[PDB]
Amino acid sequence: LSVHVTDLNRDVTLRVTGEVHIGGVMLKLVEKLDVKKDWSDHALWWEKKRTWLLKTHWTLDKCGIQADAKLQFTPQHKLLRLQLPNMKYVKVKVNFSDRVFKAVSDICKTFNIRHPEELSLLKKPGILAVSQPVTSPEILAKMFKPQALLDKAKTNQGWLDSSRSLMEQDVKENEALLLRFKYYSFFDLNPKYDAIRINQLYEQAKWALLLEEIECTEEEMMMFAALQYHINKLSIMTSENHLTTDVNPECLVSPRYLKKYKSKQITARILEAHQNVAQMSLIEAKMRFIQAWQSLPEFGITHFIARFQGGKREELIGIAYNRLIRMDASTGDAIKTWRFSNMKQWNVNWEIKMVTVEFADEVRLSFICTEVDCKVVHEFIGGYIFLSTRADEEMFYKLTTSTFTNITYRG
Template sequence: ILSTRRFNTLFVNPLEPVWLFIEKIYTLNCSLNVHLFSYIELPGLYSKTMTPTYDAHDGSPLSPTSAWFGDSALSEGNPGILAVSQPITSPEILAKMFKPQALLDKAKINQGWLDSSRSLMEQDVKENEALLLRFKYYSFFDLNPKYDAIRINQLYEQAKWAILLEEIECTEEEMMMFAALQYHINKLSIMTSENHLNNSDKEVDEVDAALSDLEITLEGGKTSTILGDITSIPELADYIKVFKPKKLTLKGYKQYWCTFKDTSISCYKSKEESSGTPAHQMNLRGCEVTPDVNISGQKFNIKLLIPVAEGMNEIWLRCDNEKQYAHWMAACRLASKGKTMADSSYNLEVQNILSFLKMQHLNPDPQLIPEQITTDINPECLVSPRYLKKYKNKQITARILEAHQNVAQMSLIEAKMRFIQAWQSLPEFGITHFIARFQGGKKEELIGIAYNRLIRMDASTGDAIKTWRFSNMKQWNVNWEIKMVTVEFADEVRLSFICTEVDCKVVHEFIGGYIFLSTRAKDQNESLDEEMFYKLTSGWV
């Protein structure tokens, strides 16, 4: 690890470029950090090339992240073991872990990020001191199951612990789905402990892999997706129930004929009036999109926070079924990024949403669940404490086995990918919280930083007060003397705040890092511009 130029930065590859940073958690018991990410002690470094390597034992492709060892002492041993998940063997491990009880606790976790432009020694990291490795930026690039077994496993581990420690919220149905996937992954990991990749995966030569990468690039991320001949921007039109919770004149959901064109939704009182002036119209560019779904209750809601001059306008959309929800949710997510349904990722987004919902379905026929020895299932290692308090272990075990029927046929690498994708689908995914005091404000609030936006949030409820997109940002500055971050956006919008619990350098690194990642290209021959990264993140300290 210390062989890299910046001691506490690990480089992945020119295309990712996902940066794996070392986080020093001051509020946790250091002896527990090793348990949290025990695989970081195993040998393995990250490659600077996209060329896959093959295991000499069985010819199956390793992650390219295992290829670069050089003369490092880390080259000893089997790097493929980094692709193997380590099951949680004791509920006592979870019981002793720090679990955030409120949003402010989640923000305090981020106090421990180290400075990527300074060495470990400069930051008073002592010999034999335990550190926690995490992916700092939630912007993952080209996760290819054929190559990236190690990186996928590392992301799976981070997602697993975030859910078990309740660092990110999920519904009861989602928790059982995550538990079923985790149980399935644990079983397959034990079966393949001597062979780090799933035996069902076929051998892939480099030519096939290159062709596959080309297909992924052209088709928006999935080889099974076939692009149609789009000569016009697709549209949606259907009856949707609309609710404005902050508007007293509208006390409940009201059904409208809604049309979704480009990035806007128009609401009409009936289908027959759709050729006239809409009763309501909303542009979703830059909005916050949050799912509110309960499969068993047949609730398929989409919560929208649309930026307006005075703040955020809240709108809820209620769909009738999964299919309608998947199409409208996918369109809303793309529109929030300024994209239309003509984008190649739209169909993939729809399929991912449907797949996510399908995994949460309960098996209607208990007889289809095979007789199993339930002693190999320990719910206390698969489910977060909140749900352990709500149900007995026997009840949770039955629900995990029931949910397992939806994922039982998945390969190991597919199950991990589904776990990561489901994690990415959670409303709170990808938002890093910091406690801040905004200029002109008298109380502490939260600033949330995501890959494409800044969010001013209510510290008690987590509700978004205002959102600013990086695409509208002109520049940002840091006053190092008073520790104030100032961000200037288009239309003369200016945002200034002071982080009260963390050095402003940490926030500066998040903003600069995400700006850097937004400039990445899919050209596999492009070299990683390390100097640009440090220029955007180091500042003048």
């Protein structure tokens, strides 16, 4: 066995039986390496078979490791540059051996974000809560992409397999991944807990509109623009520690408090309370932005390249929280819509790379995508269904030629 230690950049030849446990190989090297530093988080990785040799109690015979096979001994945790929904990069350390879903779950608790199942990873300290507009229009124009439907549909091929690890999906250390809200069904947006969660969701929406990733009318746009201007004003209040109006604070309390406190003591306790008032007004203002965003006709759709039965042209399959949509690749016009509530079950033919959905009233849908898109779309369908049952991390992996049944089929 040739074993490469990644961080020390050294290859080690090891004498192997075939009956010795994986933990044995680890034991054989630590004695052979004889180094005074911590090996606690290192694990064996087999890039030839793109699988972790995590089950340590098992033997080499069960794993089938041939002679002169190139194994790696690598730390599970690596550094990863994540771009938040606010388009700001943050450096964090994540487990490259954990399932992506669990990885995202841990990240959200770290970032203080509830319901991580709404978020995922996409291929290309007070910063988590503060939201500020750019300094100049040039910054926006410099970030501008074509944002055409085919450009977006291509990007959606990058959604990671939530049931696999980071290492199995061609992600090296210090590469850039996008942290994004993947499913557009937001459950319980509670201002009492989700100050950071709501802020990022608002930011994701704000950029999507600014960078024309989603379309809206001029009236809608000016409305969204006004909200940002409003939200910035509210933000200033949360930091303001002074009277900034022409109103006497003593006019806002009952006269019995004029006897108990001096004028400065009233101005103080009101401003303290006002900061808490504006803090919730801030969150609720961002809530309205999101609500308007949610009500847009083109909201909540994820596009994938697909050809439908009897089709002569390139088209788009679109997945929303409540429906699947056949779309024109140029205009985005809805050709036909099937609703998820009317879905009994669905089929995935991995050979032909075809998805088939069965609905009530014997309605049947069939289309064909890229093979990568098949796993992505499969996870999207099962995910949106799994999210509809919120009132269980294991069930998410259950729902993500295979056949799966909609648990919420009525009739």
